[PDB]
Amino acid sequence: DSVYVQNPQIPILVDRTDNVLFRIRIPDATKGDVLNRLTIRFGNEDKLSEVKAVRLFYAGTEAATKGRSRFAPVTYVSSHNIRNTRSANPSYSIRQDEVTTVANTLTLKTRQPMVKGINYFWVSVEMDRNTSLLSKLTSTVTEVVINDKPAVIAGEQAAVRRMGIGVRHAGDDGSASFRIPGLVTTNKGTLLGVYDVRYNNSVALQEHIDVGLSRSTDKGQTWEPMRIAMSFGETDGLPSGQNGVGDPSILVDERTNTVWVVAAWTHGMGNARAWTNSMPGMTPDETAQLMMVKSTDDGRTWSESTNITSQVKDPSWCFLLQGPGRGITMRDGTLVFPIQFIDSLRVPHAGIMYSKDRGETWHIHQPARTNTTEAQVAEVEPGVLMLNMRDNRGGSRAVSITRDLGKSWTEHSSNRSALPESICMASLISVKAKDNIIGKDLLLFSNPNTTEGRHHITIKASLDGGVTWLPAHQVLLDEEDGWGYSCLSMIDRETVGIFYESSVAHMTFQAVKIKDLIR
Amino acid sequence: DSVYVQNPQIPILVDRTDNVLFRIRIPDATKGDVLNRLTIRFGNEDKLSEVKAVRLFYAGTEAATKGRSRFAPVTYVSSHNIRNTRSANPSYSIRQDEVTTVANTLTLKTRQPMVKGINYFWVSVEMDRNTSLLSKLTSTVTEVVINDKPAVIAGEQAAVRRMGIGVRHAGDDGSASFRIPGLVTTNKGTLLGVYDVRYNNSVALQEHIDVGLSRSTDKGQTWEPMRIAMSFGETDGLPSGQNGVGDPSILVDERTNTVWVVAAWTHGMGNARAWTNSMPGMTPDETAQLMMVKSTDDGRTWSESTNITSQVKDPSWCFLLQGPGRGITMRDGTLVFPIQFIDSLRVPHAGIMYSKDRGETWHIHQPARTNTTEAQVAEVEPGVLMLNMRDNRGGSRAVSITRDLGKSWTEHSSNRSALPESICMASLISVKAKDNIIGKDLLLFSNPNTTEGRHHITIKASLDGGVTWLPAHQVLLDEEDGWGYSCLSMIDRETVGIFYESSVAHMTFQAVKIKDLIR
Ligand SMILES: CC(=O)N[C@@H]1[C@@H]([C@H](O)[C@H](O)CO)O[C@@](OC[C@H]2O[C@@H](O[C@H]([C@H](O)[C@@H](O)C=O)[C@H](O)CO)[C@H](O)[C@@H](O)[C@H]2O)(C(=O)O)C[C@@H]1O
Ligand SMILES: CC(=O)N[C@@H]1[C@@H]([C@H](O)[C@H](O)CO)O[C@@](OC[C@H]2O[C@@H](O[C@H]([C@H](O)[C@@H](O)C=O)[C@H](O)CO)[C@H](O)[C@@H](O)[C@H]2O)(C(=O)O)C[C@@H]1O
């Protein structure tokens, strides 16, 4: 009979006990058939001394109504189960074999009698906790033996597998979930990742939500314990569940290395979504408040929050907040945070908010585009800001240019064409020629590369200021289902970091060589 | 202004830290208004020595879009949060005052400045863990002072509150949820309650599900630690997630005091629902299997499972299983378990399965009615079996009679008329005249007393063999939302037990005097 193999392009987490290397479907088994041996081969230059162990699991059969093309009956390693996100659910997968000394050829064994029809097995890889985030595996199933006969192998399994690290898992420090990533590199090379700490569940404001921060001084190989960057606990004697703060955006003031976090504080509003329940006005009791904290010590400690609402919110707006992810420093020292507001008629608009005085005062001019929400901004050329926007019309990112900090806007050539989306947050950054190994100005963009669902998390690079995104200049990181938000920061001259919601952890960090993007 | 009070008809659990006694809405507060004190009065005959503590909580305000007639913005005490089902979520409710020695008059205070518009407070009652299940509280909010003026109190708050006990809470013994209650009284007066232990989540078979059992030798004041009555773990080397057993039904063989549990074992079927994925055949690999265990020691220990599929399942049926809840012993010693089968055309039918030989052999004859599922059976008069059925047409219970153990069936006068339902499991039992204090044959019925959703869990009594269910002969136990399944058993001559899925715990036990049903 014929055997099918999948090598899923998902991150192998260095901090996990189990990671799916291969999924295998045996579609047409006779009752009693036994998978005696499976052989995997790794590429000659793979660093197999970083592989702690490889495992073969059996996961039984398929439901009668689910057809014959799936590679599994269920998620093998959960990213949501607060009681276990790090190993295979033992109730879905039974270990058959384990090898703890991994060579270029590897054989795994089973004595499990198969059921009639579909049978599922899969290969777990466990990595050394100190595995280089830049390391890659090129693994293939080369032989599968059933009843002492080699079987015909089919399936696309030629993926070059990448490493990652689960910075936050569901359930960490008692929190149900973590959402809405932001990432910057400080002037010291320190990585700062921000996110919602969603304690009770995974719904947005209003709820019990604080802004968490994870700090790495070693390019993401290690992360310090979670800091609360921003929190309103029981302000004015209202429950913490009616005092949430979230959808954070973080920037480094590149002139001072002062780090800024802006977030939306909801005060009251029962247990309902702020998106529909934030109302016109200015006071905390009336409307969502635009709040900021700062760190003068490379993200170790955080100021008390300052309320910036009165400086920038039109009273008639239902809701003003930051675009989640990150802000920028411009070449002339202006600090810029993307923003979004819901007007009196409940129409959302993306725009920008800027400070020319090191974050003392903030200003908003004109919206970029009707019916847009979350946006990220890059200085594509000197004094020239590119706004890349989530568009409620569906299908594709909106792209506008301002050269007057949003007093006026022009559509970009790439607007509503060049970058597919499913209506989801996306990351965009600029990289100066002198600041990277290619020696050319780059734009780097990340989002779920699809018009439906949130999957195929992809980094794209542009060499012509975001006019063109050539297919060759793209790295697929995560082809499976997630919440889809992502944020990019250059780690060093050679490597871009991505902090994102993945199929494998709520907050996932990966590092990618620029030379893999632009060959 | 004007203040609104709710006294919700939900069980006060003796094992909980918090129970909602009163919910209060202050609809039209001015910013800064303060609830200086509210006074509660308890009835003259209340056993206040059993009240451990009373608490006043503030829960903030309401969402602008959610209207002005709710009594809360959120569930105050969760029945689903595996991390806490026993106390108020501290993120939704802030304690204002607390009294730990309770008199007939009681004053609670706050210094919380209210927000403009809607403000929510509520009163928690905590009972001594040894509080009598038969105790009742008659409590009223008699005074509410705001800015040192008495306010006008409105609302229905005259409810006579009853006690109950949370036998199983979400998260107990590591299990995500508990569902599908069954209850019997052994010849020794011992209460035996069965249920699905749904480890991973709350979905039906197929999943990692065992049959749990809780035992009480003191009329439900105490429950012995959970026993696994039936389990298939990793049978044939298939995951425990593809070896679930559930939807249990329990009966006591009144002649021998041998206790029987029947359940559906699903083997394989991926991670999909057995209702649509169980297929024709006879083997465990082919179709859901009918399994039975027994206890000869009053439910302390349980036999290994016997497979009775071959005796009673037509090969062409997609799915044969017990009707969840309980079976009976007839006056002539016949053991009867309600059953249901899905035929070759996917049409479900309710019927009965019986043993005349102490459970050695089982027989099924003819279905009672097309497009029915879960049913419970009672011997309403000698040799006369009433089958009460969940009906997919909606709105009302189907009721049929057999005098020949299901060879033939007659429609009852009460069919599709007398008993409202929303398509949900219901409990029906018979009580002999000599076996209860009323000295008359009773039928007792429990279900969610509604045509939409699952709420208003109500015990109903009939004096005329289920022809008439007079409104006067009904007790409302739970007016809030739950999963709706229930099972009745007489505890003694004077009191009926109900083991049910409630708004306050996955498995809830309450005891009700017959004299409260029939006055
Ligand atoms: C302040 C604010 O509301 N926050 C942001 C919202 C924002 O509402 C929109 O940009 C406005 O148009 O976008 C996000 O959440 C809102 C959506 O959540 C959906 O449910 C899940 C759920 O986010 C997840 O957490 C499971 O629990 C997802 O669809 C994931 O696929 C709901 O269908 C809607 O409420 C839907 O509006 C988003 O993810 O897009 C996250 C962000 O915080
Ligand atoms: C063997 C078997 O399947 N078992 C029983 C099924 C059975 O399928 C039906 O009697 C046959 O027609 O009935 C139960 O589930 C069937 C429904 O469950 C509903 O979801 C309820 C929720 O109570 C809902 O009603 C909100 O109020 C859950 O609690 C979810 O966790 C689904 O929404 C339906 O689509 C539907 O699938 C039931 O509870 O009725 C559970 C029982 O074990």
Numbering used by the authors:
A (entry chain A), B (entry chain B): 34 to 552
Quote what the paper states about this structure.
We also use non-catalytic (D237A) variant to characterise molecular interactions while in complex with the natural substrates 3- and 6-siallylactose. Using this mutant we produced crystals and determined structures for the NanH-D237A-apo protein (1.7 Å) and complexes with 3-SL (2.06 Å) and 6-SL (1.90 Å). As might be expected, the terminal sialic acid of 3-SL and 6-SL are positioned in the active site of NanH-D237A with their carboxyl-groups (C1) co-ordinated by a hydrogen bonding network with the arginine triad residues (R423, R487 and R212) and the N-acetyl group hydrogen bonds with D280 in a similar manner to that seen in the NanH-oseltamivir model. The pyranose ring sits in a distorted boat conformation, while as a result of the D237A mutation, the C4-OH group makes contact with R231. Of note here, when the 3-SL and 6-SL structural models are overlaid, the sialic acid portion of 6-SL occupies a near identical space to that of 3-SL with no substantial differences (≥0.1 Å) between the hydrogen bond lengths connecting the 3-SL and 6-SL terminal sialic acids to the conserved catalytic residues. Perhaps unsurprisingly the glycosidic linkage between C2 of sialic acid and the underlying galactose is in a near identical position in 3D space for both the 3-SL and 6-SL models, a phenomenon also seen in other proteins — such as Influenza A (HA) — the only other sialidase structures with these substrates in the active site. The galactose of the 3-SL complex is perpendicular to the sialic acid residue and pointing out of the active site whilst in contrast, the angle made by the galactose to the sialic acid in the 6-SL structure is different and directs the galactose into the central cleft of the enzyme dimer. In both cases no hydrogen bonding network could be seen between galactose and the protein backbone, indicating it may exist in various orientations. Of note, there is no displacement of W308 in the 3-SL or 6-SL models in contrast with the NanH-oseltamivir model.
